[PDB]
Design a protein around this ligand. Structure first.
Ligand SMILES: CO[C@H](C[C@H](CCN(C)CCCc1ccc(F)c(C)c1)C(=O)NO)c1ccc(F)cc1
Ligand SMILES: [Zn+2]
Length: 399
């Protein structure tokens, strides 16, 4: 079990794993109910009008997006019952990922991926960066700051626009300097998009889509995301190609991979020297020794008998390759043994309402492709024309 409590949206607040929280969006917001599903991971069953307060309007834009498929519904995820169904869906998707060895590994890497304590103006002092925390409300209406790695939140305006995003910093490029930052994944388990394989019409397994986003989060928590302005020539970012994997990832050549490899060895070495020169820490509950050990475990640092850290090249290479070549969408497709589109780019627009919460629809083990039934054959379970009761087709947005 990756998620040990089976939360109901109604369940009473306890200020520990069910609480009203505020995120550090740099805006005034009212508290939202949130759920801690595992150490360092929370879920917020709300439409995301928060990570960017400049994105409150859940209505469609005058200029329709052209690729990929898009869909708008301002009322989705507004009622307690959808929030409850949302929460059970996301939990179920976590258990499906965790039931795989690749998933278990990915999720463990995410939990260790504590964002680095680079908040101090003093180069000898460790200090948390506030945008890597949330504020949890207490009985007396005060707030306590809690550190976290990951938040799953409902989509913004485009219901099927999933993405992994995070709060930035004034000088630091936290997702690219090796530090990392808390990641916010806009995601819905209540909808999916189709692909073709006339041609057969299939639905993407949303455990695959979630895994896709978790892979982004993995990169960004370890501060090794590829700048989005680095693109493979249409136009697709290296970061997407890397995340998707399969034949797509081999388009990032051998030479650019080596630069990134060297670049990040150098980052990890810098973080090791910041830790070695650390003489003080801000905060009441964690010792400098304790945080030094947290980052030793994260970056897989070597510790000598005198307490000093260094990077082992062998363990670096393995970690790096793990996060970038092993954790890929293509690799999850293999482990899940489901059908998935063959490339990142997908021009065959189709969106569906689904409901993976009932076991008669979708299980942790087989997804839609229920074993020992007609849906285990030929990915029938994902065939939107065979398993049509599980995929209610929606009008994709055209403007
Ligand atoms: C799981 O969500 C992805 C798109 C979304 C990026 C959205 N933007 C911010 C990035 C790039 C957009 C894009 C997506 C596909 C595509 F073919 C082209 C030319 C461009 C994303 O990649 N989040 O991590 C998806 C891919 C194929 C699909 F059919 C449906 C969804
Ligand atoms: Zn992506």
């Amino acid at each position: 079990g990756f998620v040990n409590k089976q939360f109901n949206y109604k369940d009473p607040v306890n200020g520990v794993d069910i609480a009203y929280i505020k995120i550090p969006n740099a805006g005034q917001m009212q508290p939202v109910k949130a759920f801690k599903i595992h150490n360092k991971i929370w879920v917020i069953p709300e439409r995301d009008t928060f990570t960017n307060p400049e994105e409150g309007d859940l209505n469609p834009p005058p200029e329709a997006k052209q690729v990929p498929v898009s869909y708008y519904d301002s009322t989705y995820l507004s009622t307690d019952n959808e929030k409850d169904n949302y929460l059970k869906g996301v939990t179920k998707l976590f258990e499906r990922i965790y039931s795989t060895d690749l998933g278990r590994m990915l999720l463990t890497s995410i939990v260790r991926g504590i964002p680095f304590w680079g908040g101090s103006t003093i180069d000898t002092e460790l200090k948390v960066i506030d945008t890597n925390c949330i504020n949890v409300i207490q009985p007396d209406g005060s707030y306590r700051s809690e550190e976290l790695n990951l938040v799953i939140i409902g989509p913004s305006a485009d219901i099927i626009q999933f993405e992994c995003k995070s709060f930035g910093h004034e000088v630091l490029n936290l997702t690219r300097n090796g530090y990392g930052s808390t990641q916010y994944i806009r995601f819905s388990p209540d909808f999916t998009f189709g692909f073709e394989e006339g041609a057969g019409k299939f639905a993407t397994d949303p455990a695959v889509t979630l895994a896709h986003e978790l892979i982004h989060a993995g990169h960004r928590l370890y501060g090794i995301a590829i700048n989005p302005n680095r693109v493979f020539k249409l136009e697709v970012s290296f970061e997407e190609l890397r995340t998707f994997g399969g034949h797509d990832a081999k388009f990032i050549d051998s030479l650019q991979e080596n630069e990134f490899r060297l670049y990040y060895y150098n980052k990890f070495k810098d973080i090791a020297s910041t830790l070695n020169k650390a003489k003080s820490i801000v905060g009441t509950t964690a010792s400098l020794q304790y945080m030094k050990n947290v980052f030793k475990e994260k970056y897989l640092l070597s510790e000598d008998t005198s307490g000093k850290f260094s990077v082992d090249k062998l363990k670096f290479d393995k970690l790096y390759k793990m996060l970038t070549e092993i954790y890929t969408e293509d690799n999850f497709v293999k482990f899940f043994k489901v059908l998935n589109r063959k490339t990142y780019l997908n021009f065959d627009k189709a969106v569906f309402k689904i409901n993976i919460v009932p076991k008669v629809n979708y299980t942790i083990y087989d997804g839609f492709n229920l074993r020992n039934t007609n849906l285990a054959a030929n990915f029938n379970g994902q065939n939107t024309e065979i398993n049509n009761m599980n995929f209610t087709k929606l009008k994709n947005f055209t403007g």
